[PDB]
Design a protein around this ligand. Structure first.
Ligand code: ZN
Lengths: 286, 68, 273, 68, 67
């Protein structure tokens, strides 16, 4: 297993360019490329990637072609340029994985036993996390269920290398928000958090509706981890919690009041100084 | 093209418009750069739906920022 | 005819990131690579993509432009669907500044031999400190034209806004041999947002609460500093007939911190029940 | 314009000896044009012709435009 | 204009003249912005009689500056 997959900005920019390059003329679904990177104790660092010519057929969901020799000699070239980059997975721009992806993941496993495929939804721009890292697992499913391939999910995040960091910061240079935050951006962060929580709850509710209506089978497991979500509610309005909450709210409110008083006194002093200055100028004019 | 557009300012003549539209469609950078001004001058204040439609259709279809 | 000062190079975001990453990776040694793209017109140089090439012991030079690697990568990228033509070459000058040396001059005429409008791009990786990308584009002027009473490039417009160049280029003979090309990075809206996805905070960060035991200590500290500042402000105002700015900054910090923490607390109390 | 034409060529003279052979010649090419717009008076253009030919490429375009 | 109307050639020409940052040849377009500061003494269809009229310059004379 893999604890994490940190994706550099270079690979997402490269997959964006690859999808734009292919779909500009070849209107097609997911475009497949290979993701290189460096390992760690357990966390993968995806650093560079390339595109492999791939074709697919919507019929039989198995008529596809991802080149073998192309992958091999792109890696030859990349290793010659930089030998630290190892094949660590592959990517496709399709928002959803296809029935076909199992074969491509096995083909990648032939090049890397712990191969992890990263879905990068280039077309949509949304709440966040445009990368989803998935790993193939194989087990008897413990609790006596028929076995299948399945793609276990591994968490992903977007990190950056110093050169990539300065590159991207200079690349934006027009919408980058202040890192200090300030009240407006903290409030917008809070609103964004509320929106994200609402979206996640809506997705979970849709999944639960699908399960209840029978359109999806009851997982019988992990669903009770969602039940664990339901149990973890803090249960506010408890007397001790209410008293502590009021105590800390007043502790913050007194500091807010002191700062507001400080600011008001400073503003009054500034206004007195300005009135004195303008009267001094008016009387000195004569 | 620049001279024809300037001299035929607001004349709203269909023939001059068509010729300047062909010149714009030639996509020859500087030639299109002058053709844009000429087509604006001949259509000056005309509000021809065809004129603005073709102009914008070329505007978000072509390279050569000078032509833009 | 003569080139124009309005000529500029359009570097895609991926191309710029690739060049900076390669320059940092090859440090302290100098790297080089081709610059795929298309000239499109006289006044533009669209650098769509750049791919690195294996490093050779000769450094950035013509013998390090191995045609087997270049040809294989070119035809095979075109097989993937990337049929661009070479428009120039980028190379790294760590701690040197954006300028062309004599060897770079030889490489640039070798590049101009097959493609007249080739561009030599110089990147200083170590000097490309956070918030400052030191990148420049050059093209050689032969001595024949500039000696013979001819301006190296006509300024048909006001796009010569390019500020006074770094004096390092002047000492290394910028305008004597290689006219610099003004730069213009091309960024799409998709790549802009998906580069924004880098530092974007997660939704759980907005609703999270700072450590309450830490918030109290921060409040204590800043309020005590405000007390010292109030003493200084009283002394300064009384002895009048920079405590004020420091007091205002401390007040801004205290108010934003406490207000944000309180509002997060209320949102969490309502949302999770 | 013809009968009431009066342009101070002295300022153009003390400008044309101040140009350091930079691109500003083009500006001078149009500046006198402004001083001679609609006056059909190319007296400076005829008197100073070697410097008129000292500029080429798009500067020739500018010079012909000024003459017109 | 003289009657308070907007002169379309003048505004057009000044706009394309200000559009000289990107193209020097457009500068001559400023010609369309100039309007002659003249009054013509035409009485008949083709007659320009030498009519003598004066001004009301209060302190002194002005206009054509310097040699
Ligand atoms: Zn060099």
């Amino acid at each position: 297993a893999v604890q994490k997959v940190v994706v550099h900005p270079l690979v997402l920019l490269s997959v964006v360019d690859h999808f734009n390059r292919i779909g500009k003329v070849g209107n097609q679904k997911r475009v497949v490329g290979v993701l290189l990177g460096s390992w760690q104790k357990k966390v993968l660092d995806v650093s560079n990637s390339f595109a492999v010519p791939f074709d697919e057929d919507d019929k039989d969901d198995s008529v596809w072609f991802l080149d073998h020799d192309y992958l091999e000699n792109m890696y030859g070239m990349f290793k010659k340029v930089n030998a630290r980059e190892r094949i660590v997975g592959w990517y496709h721009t399709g928002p959803k994985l296809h029935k076909n992806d199992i074969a491509i993941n096995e083909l990648m496993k032939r090049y890397c036993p712990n191969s992890v495929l990263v879905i990068i939804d280039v077309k949509p721009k949304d709440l966040g996390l445009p990368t989803e890292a998935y790993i193939s697992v194989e087990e008897v499913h413990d609790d006596g269920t028929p076995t299948s391939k399945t793609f276990e999910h591994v968490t992903s995040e977007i990190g950056a290398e110093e050169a990539e960091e300065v590159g991207v910061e200079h690349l934006l240079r027009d919408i980058k928000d202040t890192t200090v935050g300030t009240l407006s951006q903290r409030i917008t962060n809070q609103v964004h958090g509320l929106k994200g929580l609402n979206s996640k709850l809506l997705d979970i509710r849709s999944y639960l509706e699908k399960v209840a209506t029978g359109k999806l089978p009851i997982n019988h497991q992990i669903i009770y981890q969602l039940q664990d979500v339901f149990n973890l509610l803090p249960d506010v309005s408890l007397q001790e919690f209410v008293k502590a909450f009021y105590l800390k709210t007043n502790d913050q409110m007194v500091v807010v009041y002191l700062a507001s008083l400080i600011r008001s006194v400073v503003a009054l002093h500034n206004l007195i100084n300005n009135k004195i200055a303008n009267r001094d100028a008016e009387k000195k004019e004569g | 093209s620049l001279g024809l557009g300037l001299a035929a300012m607001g004349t709203a003549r269909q023939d001059v418009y068509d010729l300047l539209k062909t010149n714009l469609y030639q996509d020859d950078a500087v030639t299109g750069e002058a053709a844009g001004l000429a087509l604006g001058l001949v259509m000056l204040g005309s509000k021809n739906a065809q004129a603005i439609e073709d102009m914008v259709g070329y505007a978000q279809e072509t390279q050569h920022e000078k032509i833009l | 005819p003569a080139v124009d000062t309005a000529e500029q190079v359009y570097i895609s975001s991926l191309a710029l990131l690739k060049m900076l990453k390669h320059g940092r990776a090859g440090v302290p040694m100098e790297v080089m690579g081709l610059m795929l793209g298309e000239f499109v017109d006289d006044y533009t140089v669209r650098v769509i993509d750049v791919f690195a090439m294996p490093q050779s012991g000769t450094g950035v030079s013509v013998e390090a432009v191995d045609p087997v690697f270049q040809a294989k990568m070119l035809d095979m990228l075109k097989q993937t669907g990337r049929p661009e033509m070479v428009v120039g070459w980028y190379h790294s000058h760590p701690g040197f500044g954006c300028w062309l040396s004599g060897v770079d001059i030889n490489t640039q005429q070798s590049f101009e031999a097959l493609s007249e409008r080739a561009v030599a791009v110089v990147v200083d990786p170590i000097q490309s400190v956070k918030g400052k990308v030191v990148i420049d584009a050059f093209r050689l002027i032969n001595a024949n034209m500039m000696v013979l009473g001819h301006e190296p490039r006509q300024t048909t417009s006001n796009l010569g806004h390019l500020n006074k160049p770094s004096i390092q280029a002047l000492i290394h003979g910028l305008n004597r041999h290689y006219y610099s090309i003004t730069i213009n990075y091309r960024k799409n809206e998709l790549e802009q947002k998906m580069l924004l996805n880098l530092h974007k905070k997660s939704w759980m960060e907005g609703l999270t609460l700072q450590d309450y035991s830490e918030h109290c200590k921060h409040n204590e500290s800043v309020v005590k500093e405000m007390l010292e500042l109030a003493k200084n402000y009283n002394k300064a105002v009384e002895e009048e007939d920079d405590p004020k700015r420091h007091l205002e900054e401390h007040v801004d910090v205290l108010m934003t911190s406490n207000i944000v923490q309180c509002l997060a607390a209320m949102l969490d109390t309502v949302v999770f029940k | 314009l013809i009968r009431n034409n009066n342009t101070d060529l002295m300022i153009l003279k003390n400008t044309k000896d101040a140009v350091r052979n930079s691109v500003c010649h083009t500006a001078t090419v149009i500046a006198n044009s402004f001083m001679h717009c609609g006056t059909t008076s190319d007296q400076f253009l005829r008197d100073n012709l070697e410097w008129l030919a000292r500029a080429t490429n798009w500067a020739k375009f500018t010079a012909t435009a000024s003459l017109g | 204009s003289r009657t308070g109307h907007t002169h379309m050639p003048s505004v057009v020409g000044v706009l394309v003249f200000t559009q000289f940052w990107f193209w020097f040849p457009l500068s001559h377009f400023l010609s369309l912005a100039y309007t002659p500061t003249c009054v013509i003494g035409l009485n008949k269809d083709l007659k320009m009689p030498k009519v003598q009229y004066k001004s009301n310059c209060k302190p002194s004379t002005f206009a054509y500056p310097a040699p």
